[PDB]
């Protein structure tokens, strides 16, 4: 972490639960600039007691353009099925006038009332056959009840959400100072408040923004692929949209039993005949219908924490090479400590702070920094101050020293410098 | 790697699943243009990044789960904001750098006589 | 606590499970959402 900021320790409420190690809980707010991608940003915590302190790092991983799931619906696959029970008058004894009321759920004509494998199908009578042609010897016409089924025998289910926007987002790793880590995808473009543990993060810098048309994602449950469309969506199915049946139960997205999803009026193509009704439909698949594409300064606010609470030597080992590179030179220092402790800033380091952790053994931790010349003095690392200094030549983005070909060109550049002035001086008198 | 998007990578896969999961980036904020590619057979893969480091060790977590490669790289375009480099000097190398100036004009003088 | 301010319908992202419900949301902060300018 090249960018590091200490805590604002003016909030002190520390209870001495044990004399040997203290306890303290605080809160507040934090303001951190965003770090370069692929890096982690540290957070120093300060305490009145000298020996002990904690830290917190946040690693970023990616930058992309996603949008939040504002809603959620499922789309099964409708098939329009229909039966027809064909009575004739004086045999079913139906009225001369067809009953305007229809119980679309019971259907007492055929086995009273039970579960209808369609979702709120329609009902109705039909025109009439009468005579010896249809056999029941009544010249009066005949009433015929018909059904319409929406069915999903082998369903393929898509989940959708109409965010209808595009806001930058990043990949964030959290590391609680106790040692616990939490991963989450915060929509840092917006002032979102992801809730986890004690702390909450929120918006960052939307250093770039871009626009796109009304598009939402279309994803399949079995995960065939990832799909995109104009993706029209609402609480009800508007005409010509991608999704007609929007059902809010995956467990009920296979069949159609849940009442949350609502049919479209006269959607099933029922048509009649002289004897019985037959099925058709005008429904449209998700594909080949409405499709335009085909996929192949972060900060956090502080809550009520659980903040926790000798000899140490630095003993550097080596230095790597960087200056003016967006990564910095990775320099290792081999330390041993009697306690699991932290390291702190070097005043003459003159670049940034340190958040080094050491176990109770001689470990080495290597960290990335850059400097034109090596100074590395005045580090208040751990337990007591120490002053160790190295000496090494930094590597900076320069020309090629391998062949020194530019040296030959440099000598040829300075040719006849005084000759031009000598000739111009003589011509200057005549020209002036 | 660097600002240029093209890099040379040689990785191989030992699997037969038709479904291939994601891949990852490298250090210093990458986004590899080819994260998913069919994993049915033994097809070698070459990704592109802008890393340009020395070890250039990175990782990916779809199925490989954070392996640690090693590398060593060493000479590119010599453009730089700084000019030359600090030198020992002390009048021992500067004197050698400066040579006769009339010698260069002598060569051009001979060409003029031959042309005329 | 005051009744003058009114919630937005189904604004809180409640979703269910096999045992108990969990919280999410789709709300947006004032910043990085609808912003065209920034006073010094």
């Amino acid at each position: 972490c090249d960018e590091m900021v200490h805590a604002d320790s003016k909030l002190v409420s520390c209870r001495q639960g044990s004399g040997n190690m203290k306890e303290c809980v605080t809160t507040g707010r934090a303001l951190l600039p965003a770090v370069n991608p692929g890096q982690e940003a540290c957070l120093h915590f300060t305490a009145p007691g000298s020996p002990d302190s904690k830290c917190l790092k946040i690693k970023v991983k990616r930058i992309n353009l996603k949008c939040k799931k504002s809603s959620s619906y499922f789309v099964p696959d409708a098939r329009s099925r229909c039966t027809s029970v064909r009575r004739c008058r004086w045999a079913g004894d139906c009225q001369s006038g067809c009953p305007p009321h229809f119980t679309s759920n019971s259907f007492s004509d055929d086995w009273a009332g039970k579960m209808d494998r369609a979702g709120l199908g329609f009902s109705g009578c039909s025109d009439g056959c009468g005579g010896a042609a249809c056999g029941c010897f009544n010249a009066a016409p005949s009433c015929i009840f018909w059904r319409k089924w929406v069915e999903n025998p082998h369903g393929i289910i898509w989940k959708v959400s109409p965010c209808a926007a595009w806001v930058p987002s990043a990949v964030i790793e959290l590391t609680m100072p106790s040692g616990e880590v939490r991963t989450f995808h915060p929509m840092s473009g917006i002032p979102t408040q992801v809730f986890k543990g004690v702390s909450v993060t929120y918006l960052g810098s939307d250093m770039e923004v871009s626009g796109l048309t009304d598009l939402c994602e279309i994803e399949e449950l079995k995960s065939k692929k990832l799909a995109l469309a104009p993706c029209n969506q609402a609480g009800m199915g508007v005409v010509g949209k991608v999704g007609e049946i929007q059902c809010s139960s995956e467990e009920s997205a296979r069949t159609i039993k849940k009442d949350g999803c609502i049919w479209n009026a006269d959607l099933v193509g029922i048509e009649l005949r002289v004897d019985d009704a037959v099925c058709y439909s005008k429904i449209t698949s998700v594909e080949a219908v409405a499709n335009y594409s085909a996929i192949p300064d972060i900060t956090a606010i502080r809550g009520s924490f659980s903040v926790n609470y000798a000899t140490c030597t630095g003993e550097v080992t080596n230095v790597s090479g960087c200056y003016s590179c967006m990564t910095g030179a990775k320099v290792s220092i081999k330390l041993h400590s009697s306690k699991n402790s932290t390291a702190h800033v070097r005043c003459k380091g003159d670049e940034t702070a340190f958040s080094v952790l050491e176990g109770v053994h001689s470990y080495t931790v290597s960290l990335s920094f850059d400097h034109a010349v090596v100074d590395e003095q005045c580090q208040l690392n751990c337990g007591g101050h120490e002053s160790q200094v190295t000496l090494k030549g930094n590597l900076i983005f320069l020309d090629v020293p391998k062949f020194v070909d530019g040296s030959y060109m440099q000598t040829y550049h300075s040719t006849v410098p005084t000759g031009a002035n000598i000739p111009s001086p003589t011509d200057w008198l005549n020209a002036l | 790697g660097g600002v240029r998007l093209i890099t040379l990578t040689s990785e191989l896969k030992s699997a037969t699943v038709c479904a291939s999961h994601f891949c990852s980036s490298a250090t210093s904020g990458k986004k590899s243009t080819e994260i998913h590619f069919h994993s049915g057979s033994l097809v070698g893969k070459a990704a592109i990044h802008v890393k340009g480091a020395l070890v250039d060790g990175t990782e990916f977590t779809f199925e490989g789960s954070c392996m640690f490669p090693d590398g060593c790289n060493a000479d590119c375009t010599f453009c730089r904001e700084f000019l030359k480099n600090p030198q020992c000097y002390p009048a021992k190398k500067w004197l050698f750098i400066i040579i006769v100036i009339l010698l260069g004009y002598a060569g051009l003088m001979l060409l003029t006589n031959v042309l005329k």
Side-chain angles (χ1 to χ4, degrees), chain A residues 1-398 401 406 417 419-420 423 425 431, chain B residues 1-74 86 90-91 104 106-107:
Chain A
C1 51
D2 197 2
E3 289 292 298
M4 199 305 298
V5 65
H6 59 89
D8 269 2
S9 53
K10 302 318 205 164
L11 184 44
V12 177
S13 171
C14 296
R15 67 181 183 113
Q16 314 269 347
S18 304
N20 71 349
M21 81 304 287
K22 196 185 290 184
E23 192 270 1
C24 201
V25 292
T26 53
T27 183
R29 196 183 103 191
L31 181 66
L32 282 71
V35 76
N36 260 332
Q39 304 186 23
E40 58 273 41
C42 294
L43 183 62
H44 182 33
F45 317 141
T46 47
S50 195
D52 291 331
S53 178
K54 288 290 181 69
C55 288
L56 189 143
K57 73 98 174 180
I58 291 302
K59 172 202 290 183
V60 306
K61 287 187 178 181
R62 301 157 202 178
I63 48 168
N64 53 1
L65 272 299
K66 313 316 287 203
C67 200
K68 69 145 199 185
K69 32 185 78 171
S70 71
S71 304
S72 277
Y73 293 93
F74 289 117
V75 172
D77 304 285
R79 315 285 196 189
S80 68
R81 306 319 290 192
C82 59
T83 191
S84 56
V85 294
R86 190 263 178 190
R87 291 277 158 80
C88 69
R89 296 178 70 191
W90 178 94
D93 210 351
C94 74
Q95 309 298 105
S96 300
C98 170
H101 81 94
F102 287 103
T103 312
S104 306
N105 206 3
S106 70
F107 293 138
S108 305
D109 187 19
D110 199 341
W111 178 255
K114 285 295 186 183
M115 171 295 268
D116 290 330
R117 61 190 67 87
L120 298 174
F122 285 164
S123 312
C125 304
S126 303
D127 74 320
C129 181
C134 291
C136 50
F137 61 79
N138 53 307
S142 171
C143 67
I144 297 90
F145 308 86
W146 46 275
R147 271 305 288 173
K148 322 190 292 185
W149 288 293
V150 298
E151 185 178 1
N152 204 6
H154 284 350
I156 195 67
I157 303 166
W158 291 285
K159 61 188 190 82
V160 72
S161 198
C163 197
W166 287 123
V167 178
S169 288
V171 177
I172 297 301
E173 180 61 31
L174 173 57
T175 300
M176 283 73 74
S178 78
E180 294 180 354
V181 298
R182 168 74 78 192
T183 309
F184 55 92
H185 322 313
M187 179 48 108
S188 167
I190 74 168
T192 183
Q193 310 311 310
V194 289
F195 297 162
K196 151 72 189 83
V198 175
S199 185
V200 169
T201 189
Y202 56 102
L203 61 89
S205 64
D206 51 349
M207 73 291 291
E208 295 98 8
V209 293
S210 175
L212 196 57
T213 75
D214 193 4
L215 308 167
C216 23
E217 197 272 337
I218 298 278
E219 188 40 61
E220 191 272 320
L221 283 196
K222 188 179 179 181
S223 191
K224 175 168 166 60
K225 293 294 180 183
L226 189 153
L228 183 56
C231 183
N232 194 346
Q233 188 68 358
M236 201 45 238
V238 73
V239 295
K241 79 188 287 182
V242 296
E244 275 83 28
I245 301 299
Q246 309 305 293
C247 203
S248 298
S249 307
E250 197 266 5
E251 61 87 20
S252 178
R254 306 191 288 254
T255 63
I256 306 98
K257 193 174 181 180
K258 196 69 170 189
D259 64 333
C261 56
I262 310 301
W263 191 41
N264 187 3
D266 63 274
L267 189 52
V268 168
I270 188 66
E271 69 184 36
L272 294 165
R273 274 199 284 97
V274 294
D275 190 0
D276 45 355
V278 298
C279 317
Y280 79 86
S281 178
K282 65 183 75 65
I283 199 65
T284 61
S285 180
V286 301
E287 201 73 10
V289 165
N291 199 1
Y292 282 1
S293 177
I295 312 71
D297 181 2
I298 313 300
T299 50
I301 177 173
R302 329 210 293 266
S304 74
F305 321 129
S306 158
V307 187
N308 302 3
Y309 295 93
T311 180
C312 180
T313 62
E315 300 168 348
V316 71
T317 181
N318 63 354
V319 170
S320 57
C322 181
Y323 182 76
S324 72
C325 78
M326 278 55 68
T327 69
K330 186 62 62 67
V331 289
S332 190
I333 47 174
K334 206 177 179 179
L335 288 84
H336 73 96
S337 69
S338 66
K339 315 261 166 193
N340 302 294
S341 46
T342 51
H344 200 242
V345 176
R346 180 173 290 169
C347 73
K348 199 65 169 64
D350 215 0
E351 168 76 8
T352 189
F354 310 133
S355 177
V356 189
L357 274 295
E358 287 296 328
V360 187
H361 200 315
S362 176
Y363 293 100
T364 183
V365 166
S366 191
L367 283 193
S368 69
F369 318 97
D370 48 359
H371 200 195
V373 190
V374 286
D375 202 354
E376 57 268 13
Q377 161 60 26
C378 173
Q379 49 277 13
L380 274 158
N381 46 6
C382 54
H385 187 48
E386 283 183 346
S387 296
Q388 210 280 337
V389 177
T390 68
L391 288 174
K392 212 265 173 186
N394 313 70
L395 183 47
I396 321 170
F397 291 120
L398 266 75
Chain B
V3 192
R4 294 184 180 175
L5 319 172
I6 309 181
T7 43
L8 299 176
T9 61
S10 171
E11 304 65 39
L12 187 145
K13 62 197 168 71
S14 181
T16 58
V17 58
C18 64
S20 308
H21 323 77
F22 277 45
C23 170
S24 81
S25 295
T27 177
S28 73
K30 308 290 179 286
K31 61 178 70 66
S32 73
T33 58
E34 185 177 2
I35 62 170
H36 154 82
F37 193 72
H38 71 273
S39 65
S41 58
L42 316 180
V43 179
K45 66 178 72 66
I48 57 178
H49 294 88
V50 299
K51 43 185 75 177
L54 189 148
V55 168
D56 269 321
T58 186
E59 57 201 10
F60 62 90
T61 74
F62 80 99
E63 196 170 354
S65 296
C66 284
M67 72 291 291
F68 179 75
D70 199 346
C72 52
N73 309 316

